Symmetry: D2
Subunit: 302 residues, 4 copies
């Protein structure tokens, strides 16, 4: 039924040692993530350090990634912004460059600027009016905005392009359940996130897709396929083998997990974040690689 | 002693009702706020709806407002960004366009992306290295980041351009006291904000400046002047006369207060915020105008 | 047709300087607040430092206060607790001791333990089942819990004893409007709080009551008096006169405001909070009293 | 050299299906957890639904559990309270009843009532003055209170009974590293919590104790002994075997995990929480048992 399912990892934004954009490494990371078996990619998300780049860098990254993908896989372009018209403009521009879908947080700023449900609704409704590609709602703690399942399904029922969801808040499995129950066939893509830390319970809840980290999609995807083909016991076995790595990405190495792995594997030239985001502690990085080496991920032999 | 004191109200961003920047209304807003007696101006702050504008609009507004000010009053340009290098380029770009000062929140994003103290120091340290004009550290709830009074005082003593502070967190008065106690004359500008709702308590604590709303800086400034010259009772009376309007701005009409006042007075073409920021409830606007129509602010008697 | 309206100040808990309960000062505090014109009292709220007392002290305080009030004014007993059965038992006990109303936060603990909307509904429903006095829903930032106006309105329509609301989250005035619009006659008591900092705007929105600080209800009740009688500009003039004291209470001296004023007036023996709650900075205290003295509040000329 | 090391799981508060305390099931949960090899126990913590019980119930449980343990293992009694005097009174009472340690959150209430560092130091200082058994400082997100590693180390070095720490804020591993270096020999017990979700990373950092859930301490303890004996590859292997259960407890079944397992295994009569805490979704429960049934935990095998 749905247009999009499977694993859609987040593409990390690759800087040089100087903090400037490293577009060469950026294309190599996209190519590695496509070779890993990804059904699609998501760019300019919070796991791409979008908060540390400029609007001009956003446009260069959007055109560079989409032109290099060359239609090999569908790309989700994250266009989140407080202003409705800016997000619609970014969504239209991503559409023009070949995006299959846009992902947007609800309109927020910082810790205290929140938007009532009514204006959150109009935000998505107007972004929906301007574009023809599907919209994904990101439900994540970083927005500090409660998006309850009845309201999330409401937007899926009442807004044309709103069909996909990335539920990353605590208790995501039973939120996905309630979302699917209240939205029916309007829920085209009930997806989970958070680096696939709760993937198994979310699959139990009816999740169709996973927006994981970009470091090892080859490890996570056979869980989804085995679950689709009814091989539940194989899905658990693969989830169990890879969970220590997923747990270390979620709890320890964080956003920089995909880049530190890509650096060690020779995929990208630098794993540095943009200052002032803290770099990985050497012990956190050493333990990340020690776990990964036990699992033979493609990132280390690409 | 300090380079800058007095009232530095925030210039709101004037939009057309379509949604685009209304630079014609932007300049009239700047002219009025100068005519209202502002010691300076601050632009692209959170009260300017900066989170709703793009980088290109930021540059157009920085150039337009600074050019139109034409050095009549000093301008603080807010350059906050998570990335240390983006904020450093913005602050340098603001300096080269004529800014007297830059204001920066600590690096943050959303509700959960927070930066440790050691990197926050380096953030302001590297912005300091890039410019020759002073930095104003904004201490406000929107960042969700704790900047202790010792830490703020430490940055003043050890970072060259860090010298001004906008204390807006709860208990701003007693925190200003601590900041001044620990920093001394390294605290070149202990200022408050939050529309001046706590200005009288903050002046007691030693505040020498106030970043207020842009609607009625003329009603608030005599509070600062009377206090500087030891007329505390006149400071109280002016504070009391205007506190209901300050209270209605802080608690009811918020960021849109200045623009609803400017629109009523003919200063600007539209009071609309950029969607999806909620527009004023009709009763909230009417009560705002009704309160302002007891105190004769220039904004309701300027264009005509 | 409401059962309760007007001004209901939160009674502060009076400690001795040793930190133990000072019940003699507690009664004198109650008496002053009644002589100051309170239409009723609310006890054991967060503004009463309830989080710094024990369950036994709560029962000692509920009995002593209600016994001392002797039915002079209606008393709101705050009964908040995460546990549905603990709150219901507290509200029942308060009813049997003479309480006319209970106030309950939504169930919560700390900064992270939250309750889904369906369970918050069941919470207030079973508390309503247990008592025959009305419930006041406290919508305050300390809970960290979002209670939308549609949810609060549905609870008033569907839960018998849910009829009163203390709305003191940001944007209370517009929330009160939507609450009244969606709830209709089920909204028996749309009140505000936060020391009456937004009282004028809330009065415009349809508020019929205010939960203020216990320090100067004589200064604030006339604001409601003029509003109810239609003297809107008289209500504004009174408002402007006392707003600097309300503002210093809201932003500077906080919970301790009523206790510092009562101690200066000789009403109580000690203004100290229970440690580790910070005591008032000496300048914050002097400024509070300098403002108060311009307004001649009864607290400074009672004992 | 330290007085206490190993696994100190939190004892769940056992209720009846009617909501009242089920003390018979409470004693059996204690016996099972001792039978499962716990080096010690912790009672009346947030993982015990302590916020859903009364003071009278707290005292009934403190005396009931301490007497039934009969000194078989040391018990940590969580004495947290906002009031300094109340916490010290609870802590002295716990020590008089045989407690080997007390655990205390920093003083706080709700989402907004916070305490400055100076009075938090004074809070732990005066509690230590009253008691003669060690204090464990709990650093958990439920307090919404920042307790930096320098602040925690300073308390350990300057306050006699502050010697143990439960770190379960985000990034506990790196925080534990800094707390251990900063605190030196005064950190008698750098411990982690959060159901052992980050036990491996925390052990690399130098954690010596783990305060986990109470359902399967027999499965988690070998990870600590393997680390203590320097068998790092073995610690990973047992960690990897039990992580899906640990993860399900941390993200899906939560506080109710220990009670659901204990009820299934016949240890306790009821697994319900006190209303309004949401009961387990039936699918969540079935996934919990299916994962647990793969690891042969004692809780589904318990004869005494």
């Amino acid at each position: 039924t749905p247009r999009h399912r499977g694993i859609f990892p987040v593409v990390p934004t690759t800087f040089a040692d100087t903090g400037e954009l490293d577009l060469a490494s950026q294309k190599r990371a996209v190519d590695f993530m496509i070779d890993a078996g990804s059904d699609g990619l998501c760019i300019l998300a919070n796991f791409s350090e979008q908060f540390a780049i400029t609007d001009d860098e956003r446009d260069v990254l959007t055109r560079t990634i989409l032109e290099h993908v060359a239609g090999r896989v569908p790309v989700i372009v994250t266009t989140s912004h407080y202003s409705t018209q800016v997000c619609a403009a970014r969504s239209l521009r991503a559409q023009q460059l070949g995006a299959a879908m846009v992902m947007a947080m609800p309109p927020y700023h910082g810790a205290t600027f929140r938007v009532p449900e009514a204006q959150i609704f109009e935000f998505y409704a107007r972004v929906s009016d301007a574009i023809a590609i599907p919209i994904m709602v990101q439900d994540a703690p970083a927005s500090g905005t409660a998006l309850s399942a009845p309201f999330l399904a409401r937007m899926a029922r009442e807004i044309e392009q709103v069909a996909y969801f990335k539920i990353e808040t605590p208790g995501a499995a039973n939120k996905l359940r309630e979302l699917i129950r209240l939205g029916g066939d309007a829920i085209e893509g009930p997806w989970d996130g958070e680096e696939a830390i709760t993937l198994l319970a979310d699959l139990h809840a009816g999740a169709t897709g996973a927006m994981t980290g970009g470091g090892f999609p080859d490890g996570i995807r056979p869980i989804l396929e085995a679950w689709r083909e009814g091989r539940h016991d194989d899905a658990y076995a693969r989830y169990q083998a890879w969970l220590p790595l997923i747990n270390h990405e979620n709890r320890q190495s964080g956003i920089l997990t995909a880049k530190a792995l890509m650096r060690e594997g020779g995929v990208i030239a630098s794993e540095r974040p943009r200052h002032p985001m803290p770099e990985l502690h050497p012990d956190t990085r050493a333990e990340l690689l020690a776990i990964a080496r036990r699992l033979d991920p493609l990132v280390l032999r690409w």
